[PDB]
Structure formats: C-alpha cells, structure tokens
Design a protein around this ligand. Sequence first.
Ligand SMILES: CNC(=O)c1c(-c2ccc(F)cc2)oc2cc(N(Cc3cc(F)c4c(c3)COB4O)S(C)(=O)=O)c(C3CC3)cc12
Length: 544
Amino acid sequence: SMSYTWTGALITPCAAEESKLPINALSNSLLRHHNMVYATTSRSAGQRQKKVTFDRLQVLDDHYRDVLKEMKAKASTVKAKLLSVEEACKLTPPHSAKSKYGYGAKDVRNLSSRAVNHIHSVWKDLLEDTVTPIDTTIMAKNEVFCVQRKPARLIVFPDLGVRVCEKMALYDVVSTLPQVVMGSSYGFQYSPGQRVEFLVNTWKSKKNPMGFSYDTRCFDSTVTENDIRVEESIYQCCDLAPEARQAIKSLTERLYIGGPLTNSKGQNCGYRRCRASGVLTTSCGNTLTCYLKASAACRAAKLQDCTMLVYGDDLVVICESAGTQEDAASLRVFTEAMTRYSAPPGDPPQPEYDLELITSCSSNVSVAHDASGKRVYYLTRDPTTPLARAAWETARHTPVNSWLGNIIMYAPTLWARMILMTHFFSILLAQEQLEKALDCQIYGACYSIEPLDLPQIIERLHGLSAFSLHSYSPGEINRVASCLRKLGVPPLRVWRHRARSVRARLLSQGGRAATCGKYLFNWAVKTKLKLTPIPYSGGDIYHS
Ligand SMILES: CNC(=O)c1c(-c2ccc(F)cc2)oc2cc(N(Cc3cc(F)c4c(c3)COB4O)S(C)(=O)=O)c(C3CC3)cc12
C-alpha cells in the first residue's frame, strides 16, 4: 500500500509566507549571519510529497504478536471516561484553526450555542456512521532552520468539530493508557530532571552498559492500516463506556486509518493511507507503535536486559553489553527486524558505551557542577535551531514562542541561560511586558505562561541546581562556541556583560521581577548570592 496517492493539485498556503529572516533594530545584537536562517514554505511541498510517498510491506512474526498480547493485557487494566462537550471545549487552544461551519476556537471555549450544537451533531454522526471517510486539510508547516535547505513538513488535520469530538472520546485514554502499557519506558511522564535521573540510573543498572538511538525514516508514512487497527485494538482493551467504544471505532475507520486530502483552497490533493500528523492519537499512536515494533525487534536480536525509552517515534534502548563485536552484530538483526515491521532506519544505529554520546529527540546527557562542586547531569542539545528560531522571533511575533519553550525545557544549559534568558529579558524589560502571558508549546501542548513565573517553573522541572550550575564540559562549551561563530552570534563573554546589566535592571524593579534577577542571572555575578527555595503532538491541546 502506498502511503499517499496524489491528484496533482498543489498544497496551498492560507496566508502570506516569508522564507527570509526578518530584520529589525534588535536582530544584529543576537545574530549577524542572516542569510543562514530560513523558514520553510509551501513552495517546497512538492519535494516533501516525494519523500513521504512510498510502498509499505509488513511481515509480522511471533515476537510481534507476543509483545502485542502483553501490551493488551496491560491495556485491559485501564478504565477511561468520556469527556463532556464542555470539558473537551475547555481543552481547545484559543488560536486553534476555526471550523468550516461558522464558528472558531473562542466560540468553542465560550460554549456558544452554535459551536456546541455543531459538536453535538458531529458526535451523533460518529455514533451513527462508522464508514464514511472524514475530510482533512493538508498544509505546509512554516518552521525556521539554519542552512545545512529542508523542504516543508506537512500537517494533516480534520475540522474543529471533529477535533473536539476526538477529545470527548479519547483524551482520557491517550492521557492514561500509554504509561500503564509501557511503564517506565513511556518518556512523556517525566519532567526533564526526572528523565535525566531515569536515564542515569538505567545506565548504572547494567553491569556493562551499551545503548543506541534508532530513528525511523519518515515514521508517519511507515505507519500502515494494520498498525492503526492494532492501536485501536489496544484502546478497546480499556474499560470504556459503550458510547466511547463506538466513537473510537468510528474515528479509526473514518479518520485515523486514512482519508481524502483537501488543500486550503478546497481542492482534492489526494488520499492518505498512513498516520495523520494532526490528530489527537498521533503521539500516543506513534509511541505505542514504536514501542511494539522495537520491543519485538529486541527479542529477535536477543538483546539482554533491555530498558527502552520511547517518545513518539523517537527510540533509545539501553541494555547489557555482550561484547563490542557481539553488540554490533545484534544491532543489525534489530534493524532487520524493524525493517520487516515497516520501520527502516534513516541512518543505521550505532552502539554507544558512553551515555553522553547517545542523541535522541535532538538531545544528549552532559554534566556540570552545582554550587557544592557535585556532578549534576542535565539534558542539552545543539543550540543552532533554537538560536535561529530566537532570531526570527526577535523580529516577528509568532503563534508559538520557541525561545520561551527552550528556556523552560533547557534551563540548565549554558546556552539557554547565557543567551536566551539574557536576550529576551532585555526585550521584555524594554517593552515592559514581563507580566504578559505568552504561548509556548511543551510536549505538543500549548501553555500560556508569564515570564515572571519562570523561576518557580524552572525549580520544579529541574531543581534549584539549575540556577547554580558551573564547570560545564569542554565538549559542550566547544559545541556552543562553534555554533555562535557559525551563526555570527556574539561570544559568551559579551553575554555575561549583558546579563549583569539585565540583572541590575530586574533587581531595580523589585517584586517578582527582582526574583527573576536573583535566580535566573546569579551565574553572571562575581560574588554569588546563596539561593534558597522560592515560596499530544499535533493534538490541538491547551492548558493554563
Ligand atoms: C529519545 N527519548 C527520550 O525520551 C529523550 C532523550 C534521550 C534519551 C536517551 C538518551 F540516551 C539521550 C536522550 O532526551 C530527551 C530530551 C527531551 N527534552 C527536549 C524536548 C524535545 C521535544 F521534542 C519537545 C520538547 C522538549 C517540548 O515539546 B517538544 O515536543 S527535555 C530536555 O525537555 O526533557 C525529551 C522530551 C520530549 C520528551 C525526551 C528525550
């Protein structure tokens, strides 16, 4: 079965699209090499269409069925509830795409009679009809990168009314089932500090640890009808209301397995027979499907004492080494098994014998030291894309503020602290916008967050140590320094000078502002203060 069929109609935009980095009076203070930063547009959609369109073959063996039976046995212990229309509505983001039938996201959130009436009719239709394919819109995503250019990724999503109905049927399922089925292997359950702790203790639990990342090429396209039906059979193991069972069956048959693709102008672009990236079950589905295939592939490879970590289509296995040559042999068998299950790799997997050399979800573990001199592990990444996006966001207001998301999730890193915090707090000070809530996206969920609350948020996610880390590793410092030279960002010495000023300015304002000065910028001062404590990817999900 081909992942997609195409009619020839183009994937069209719904608004003007910029590819070139916008420049304002603040741009050069962050980044000088402007031509290295670009945004993707619908003009490259055709190139992506070629990449994501291919034939899938699946061969399923006993290892696959054995693991599935185990997953279903765990799923059988889960009890999930239907959300009411009101509850589902409150989970709808304020800036979620409006319905084709005369209401928007704010009408949903307000429980307006028109929006509520349509939702009730869509739900009734799901209960009454389990066959008619549901329409979807296909769009090119506009995302920002540094050169070496990527073609635009594609998003596929149904109408707002359907999206609310997905929440009613499945929000409690996708929120509760994966952790029960996959246990400690389900990566979404951890804060950044908990995840790094899990990874470290997992590495030390093995006598001779070996680990590897495995990244599938265009995972969404490798997901077959079988895969999506097997996912449904897992959901249906739950203790559910009969009305929920029918809605889940209907959504699977009419939406999740496949459907027609329509562009922004209303033309049929073709047909999908693989994972839709903009449905509620995308994250949960990919995570279950990746975990199933990978667990079965570990058994085929005879890998000893495996601990897996899975987040969507991102996979890491840490296991007991059988020797360097034996380990390398077993990874080939793994890849062969994964390939028979439809999930061949982008690059072949590599065994690693140092935890810090495994990269996954674009991240790796590194080490720094706290105020006492004790080693502290933390998750970091190559800062090139965060910084390119920060540059765009310096001159353009965007729907999601990646800089804010990055400060929160990478708070302990030397690049988030020295550059992102310093740059954006300076901007916020100048416009007196410290108290203004901003949208950012964490694990695919949209959150509205006031910058003034960052200290409390960072402590809870990473611990108090995130405000006093020092003596970073030579490898991490060198990667950061090299990235700055590459993009024409000023060197770290300049950012320390700027941070002193930004800190002084925050202290001057007092209150929560001064708390941001004290905690976020203690690294900048020569004589430190002793810091005490402070008193659904594509799923269309929102939280306060
Ligand atoms: C690969 N599997 C894992 O679970 C992860 C490893 C990893 C595992 C094993 C290794 F050996 C090395 C790294 O490192 C990780 C780092 C993160 N973070 C970064 C991050 C990545 C993202 F894609 C997103 C977000 C954050 C927010 O919203 B996004 O969807 S972090 C520092 O916030 O914790 C995550 C996040 C998304 C859950 C997972 C892993």
